[PDB]
Design a protein around this ligand. Structure first.
Ligand code: ANP
Ligand code: ANP
Ligand code: ANP
Ligand code: ANP
Ligand code: ANP
Ligand code: MG
Ligand code: MG
Ligand code: MG
Lengths: 362, 362, 362, 362, 362
DNA sequence: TTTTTTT
């Protein structure tokens, strides 16, 4: 009897496998009998115990196949084709909604019955983040809106502030919440032609640790980053398409992704300042300094600086009507799971402890 | 009347063979008659004598085949696929435990009565390795826990020290103990793309003797290694997935493995220093040199650079409760086997022989 | 009827042929009728006249075949597979023993009545070579021991000296005796990876005529060779496995071969000096030049470069107990044959002729 | 009916096509009718008029084939395979004898009544060539001996001298006589790999016109040639096998061809000077210049550059005993042709015309 | 029914189509009905309307084919194979005859009843171009004979100096007349390798506006071109085959084309100028500027750059016996046509109007 | 596709 290549493609699509060897290995595990399958009995991984019954008959015949890598290549090209169609055709709200749905899938297993995530440390992460900046959750919601709207000139945000003030901390978290990448624009004028190519097909970008020409009289190191950005005018504005180039690849023309500029207390050109819609002064405060050394429970299990923590902050603080109509259904379920586990008095006391510069107690 | 591709894949899985030519060669040895087979009678290699009788029928048909390399390729891809599956599904504790089980099986063969290793020579290696760094067994244990608790930014260790100070010796031993690959990054960056691809699904990587800039006043030649690593910060920091590539095969998107950077007294950039959680300064010690001169079996048999010598050290020094519960049973068996072969007084006499620079085993 | 692919593999395996065009060319000579084959009647090449009668039937069908190169590719891959199986499963002493057996077979053909060699001229080569270095036969024996034991870091020998001092001569002789490849590291670093890939599954490598900097006062031109070798420290160490690369094949991980570096009075970094266990300083001897001018048959027949000359030297000078058990029975036959042919007086006449700078056979 | 791949291979072997498109084009010309064929009637090209009648049937079927390039690839691979077997299995003296026989076949066609040439003009070439260097026939005979004997390190010759001194002229004539190819080593060092790959399986190479870095005070432009050539010291030696490389094929290991270096009066390093056995100082002569202006048929017909002029010179000047036994028969009938058509008084008149700086035919 | 691969090859041969996608596109236009075909009604492109009726039956079956690119590949390879055979076997005089035949075919369509070109405007082009140099008829015929006879080291011409004096104009016309390509040697020396691969199988090259280091006092920009040409002086002379090279293709061995160099007055090195045998230079005429100004169609229709204009010039002012015999029957037809519908009174009136700087046609 | 070309 014949292998169904369509069934293999269904498994690849349902699990979003873009790797031919991962697909081959996982599918070969289904060749063993379901009735006695230890992995289905003890339910380690969802990509197995959901699918083994449906695919067992096909996987037996697949294990006898002489074509196995060809079958998987076609299935992986089907998944790559769906990604490519979605990239060109989705509206930018739907792209972010797909990212949030994927993060909620990670939530549902990360905080699963097998969940190594306790709600408690993740909610302490949320309270740390919500204490970092005045009216923080509006700042995150405003960031997502301007990044989704992608409106010309009114795109890039300037994070200006002292060292050890948390600016890389939040920028690195927003890359995980949205998808995106960071660029090192400090280079001489020639090499940044290739560095800018890192933005190709990204949803979002950040310019990290931009050095300026001035500030040596304040013991800031001089560097050409800011003077470069004043020349990258059209990439910021996003009014016209720019041609972007990569290591031994030919140029792509697209609108440059929106982003964030993270900068110390450097002086800026008036032209560059006029091209940032929002300036946020990050400034350090000592009770957060003291809280951190008191609170390694934020830094273990990667909870700080992770975008899944910022999503949890949005679920806790925003009204449900602000999320997309398709994800509103899943977000109310995560609302009530937070409501049950973290009563408002427990959260308030935890945030009060953060205001007192101390970790979780009681 | 036709080749079972399934039996060949089964042999490759049982042998854990990642190389197409190795599989082709070994499987072709089975084409000759089992009854007259000198290798089965002489019992040279287990990969032959355990399997010849079972595979003889299939190997005779395989020797006539017109497809041989294609059959081997599918088998080898099955073994690489199981490695991908295990790398994505298993916890790092289980990965290290599987490696210890493989090493302990190899110890049972090697110290068995059918074996060839005198355990006295291997315990002399333990004595010599415990002299190399203070509290070596806690240092090995700390390294193991660091590679298991893969905490971002806190993933990499730096070994520093002059010529013949023991850096490569301990890195090679930890590498065998944990499993991993050595990478040379002294080559230029565009050619490192396929070098870095060797880290696919490995537990450790070691960056062997990376060359810095400067140091010519210390008679150290310059090279690109440090500058290349400083261009790879997300691979060291491990905050986000990177794309690793192999020829004529699709890329792998994974977090790059943790491990060891080794170097000879070069100056290290502050940005790179921020990513090495512990630095060990090796010193040349003349008593170890004099001991090795008089105990050349340690270097001829490669005992002091072997992971089996470090695994014997962990069995000797560490509690049972520090090992994973699956493997505790055969570890306590190995402890009583060590207590059988050695008094503590023999081991203290060995370590005194080392410290005095006289021959160990005297 | 149809072509036997197995017989083509059997010919390839018997001739140890790993070039696909060489196999194709030789097997096509068997097309023509065995009864009248001029090469069989003249007995030019053993690879032809031994095999034509057996393969004539298969070669006639092979000449009509439409996929000839595909047959030869499978045959060549079988030869490479056995070579890789031998490389992992044999001890280095067995590998040297197998190599000497192959050399002794070639000597039996050279010095038999069918052979074109004169054993007096080859023993004149042994006389000339024994004059090159002090205790030459022990230097060869110590080298063989070094290559068999393959001790970490104690693996490479450095041959140093001026122009026409004999470095390349001895290196070529040891390369034929042990088997191995010569590599040029003077070419630029970014293409050097494919040159290093020639080392795969080889017993020795010889880095020939490496250039340094800082000889220009001596009138030695500058070059990158020594800088490249200092980037390849972990390859020369042989503690860890290194990733070796052929075109269109994925990397193989193996311990890099031991061997020889030949160099002309350049300065060596102390880091690189730590990888060499012995340095041999070759000094030009005018009596050897005057001897060669008068005995040009040594250069024309390439006797003093040959491994067969060093094998004769070992048979003349070394005890039988220094050879491996399997070859001692052939070595005693060869010792008797040499003692029959050469009195010590004839040899001491030759060695005195060399020292006088006379024609060695005079 | 089926196309015979054997007949295509036979045509390629008899024509010695190592070009797939040349074979395809040539063989497709046989698809048209033999009786009407204008190319056969005119007898333009021997590769057509000898073979069309025999191959007509097969070429008609081949024109209907869907496999045409695959058929020609096998034929071309068979011609290359024979060439590689002959490289590894012939003596260099047989290789030269074969080349002379091929040039004598050309001479039979050139100076036969079908041919365009006539011997008087080519014998004037011999007279002009004999005037260029003293004892030119011994020089050419010594060169042939040097290239046949291929003595290690005593196997490259240097042609040195001013602009327009005859260096490239004589090198080209020797290159056509012996076969082999010219290499341009003035390129940058990283491209050089593929240039040197042209030498694979060749009998000679000529390093044309290498530039040095001195002598700009002599108005000689500087360049990298001599420095590149000093990196290739082990290639010029010919003691070891070097690893040659052509695009998209992995490396081939062989002894580099012997050859000629042509050079203006740049300073040469002692390391590279040691690898030349003989230096020929060309000096320009005004009577030769005046002669060529008046006898320009020598340049138009390229008689001055041709290997056939040097072969005619050897036939006129050397004993029949100096030729290989197989070719001595054709040499005596060629000597008889020359004696019959040229009196020594005509040839001495020609030599006297050249010395008088007047047109050779007057 | 099956596709005739033979008919696709016929079409490609008759179209001289050496591009696979062009062939595929052209042939897929033939699948639609011949009787309704708008392109055959409008008669836009000759490669369509001449061939569609013949090929319709085969093109409909070809549209249903699953092999379509494989069919076109075989066809294109046949066209390239004929070009290879022609390059090796044709005399240069036959090559130039073929080029003239193809240009006369264009002239028949271009001045046909369907032709979009008024022959008067092109004859006015003959009037302008006849004035550009003293007796242009002689220089062009001398150039053509020089390019046919191809005498080694005596086969390049230089145009130097004045701007707006016609150097590139006449070079472009000679280049279309003969066939061949322009080269820009000022590229980086690494790129110069690929630059020269444009000359592969070309009949001419023009080195265009090549630049040197000096001449600053004449306001000439510096450049590396002449320094690169000196590395190629052995390519220019054509005494020997050179290993020309292009991206991703193995080197090809051939004699470099003859050509023209256009240049500004840099000081050309002796080692390079010794490989050139003409300099011919231009002087701007004020009345010609006025004639172009008053007869702009000479530039707008690209008349004076074109090879058809020089062929018309040669058809007028050289005798029929100076062309190759095969084409003389077509040249008498064009002589009659031009002497019919134009008169020497009209031509001398045009060259008069040109001498007056007024509009040519009146 | 990788290698080569690009960096
Ligand atoms: N109020 C604070 N006081 C001190 N440290 C803080 C404070 N808030 C955050 N941090 C910590 O500062 C560390 C560095 O965060 P980061 O976002 O890199 O700061 P930054 O301002 O971008 N520093 P720099 O990258 O040097 O410009 C993180 O561990 C934060 O948790
Ligand atoms: N601390 C030590 N003191 C003395 N000898 C030692 C020590 N460690 C190692 N050795 C010897 O030195 C050899 C090389 O040690 P190795 O680990 O390669 O040194 P390393 O520090 O990596 N030197 P390098 O890589 O050249 O910077 C070992 O094989 C031992 O013979
Ligand atoms: N010790 C010696 N004294 C004199 N002549 C020698 C000596 N050894 C070799 N020769 C001659 O020199 C030739 C080349 O020897 P070779 O081994 O290439 O020397 P080398 O020291 O490697 N020279 P180089 O390669 O230029 O650095 C041999 O073929 C002999 O003719
Ligand atoms: N010795 C000579 N004296 C005078 N004219 C000569 C001599 N040899 C050659 N010629 C002429 O000079 C031309 C160039 O000779 P050729 O051998 O190419 O020069 P070359 O010495 O190699 N110069 P170069 O190419 O710069 O290395 C030939 O075509 C002859 O016309
Ligand atoms: N003899 C001439 N009298 C008047 N105009 C001329 C003449 N020759 C050329 N021109 C015009 O000059 C312009 C440029 O000619 P062109 O041949 O491209 O210049 P060029 O000499 O190659 N200059 P350059 O490209 O710098 O080498 C065109 O408009 C021509 O029509
Ligand atoms: Mg920061
Ligand atoms: Mg020359
Ligand atoms: Mg111009």
């Amino acid at each position: 009897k014949q292998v169904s290549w369509k069934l293999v493609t269904e498994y690849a699509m349902e699990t979003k496998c873009d790797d031919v060897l991962l697909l081959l290995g996982m599918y070969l595990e289904f060749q063993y009998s379901f009735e006695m399958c230890l992995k289905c009995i003890k339910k380690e991984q969802p990509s197995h115990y959901k699918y083994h019954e449906k695919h067992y008959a096909n996987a037996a015949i697949f294990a006898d196949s002489k074509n196995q890598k060809t079958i998987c290549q076609q299935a992986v090209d089907t998944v790559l084709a769906k990604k490519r169609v979605d990239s060109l055709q989705l509206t930018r709200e739907q792209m972010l909604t797909n990212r949030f749905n994927d993060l909620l899938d990670r939530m549902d297993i990360m905080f699963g019955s097998t969940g190594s995530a306790d709600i408690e440390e993740w909610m302490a992460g949320v309270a740390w983040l919500h204490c970092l900046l005045p009216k923080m959750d509006s700042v995150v919601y405003d960031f997502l809106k301007c990044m989704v709207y992608n409106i010309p000139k009114k795109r890039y945000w300037l994070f200006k502030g002292p060292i050890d003030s948390g600016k890389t901390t939040l920028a690195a978290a927003l890359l995980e919440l949205c998808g995106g990448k960071a660029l090192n624009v400090n280079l001489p004028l020639d090499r940044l032609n290739f560095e800018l190519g890192v933005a190709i097909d990204q949803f979002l970008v950040v310019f990290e640790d931009v050095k300026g020409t001035g500030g040596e009289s304040r013991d800031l190191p001089s560097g050409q980053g800011i003077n470069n950005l004043d020349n990258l005018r059209d990439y910021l504005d996003g009014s016209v398409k720019v041609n972007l180039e990569k290591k031994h690849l030919n140029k792509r023309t697209q609108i440059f992704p929106p982003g964030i500029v993270t900068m110390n207390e450097y002086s800026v050109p008036k032209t560059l300042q006029a091209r940032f819609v929002k300036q946020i002064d990050f400034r350090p405060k000592d009770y957060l300094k003291h809280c951190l050394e008191r609170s390694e429970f934020l830094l273990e299990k990667r909870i700080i600086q992770s975008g899944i923590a910022l999503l949890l902050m949005l679920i806790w603080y925003r009204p449900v009507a602000e999320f997309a109509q398709s994800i509103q259904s899943r977000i109310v379920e995560w609302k009530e799971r937070l409501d049950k586990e973290f009563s408002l008095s427990v959260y308030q006391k935890m945030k009060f402890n953060v205001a007192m510069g101390i970790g979780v107690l009681d």
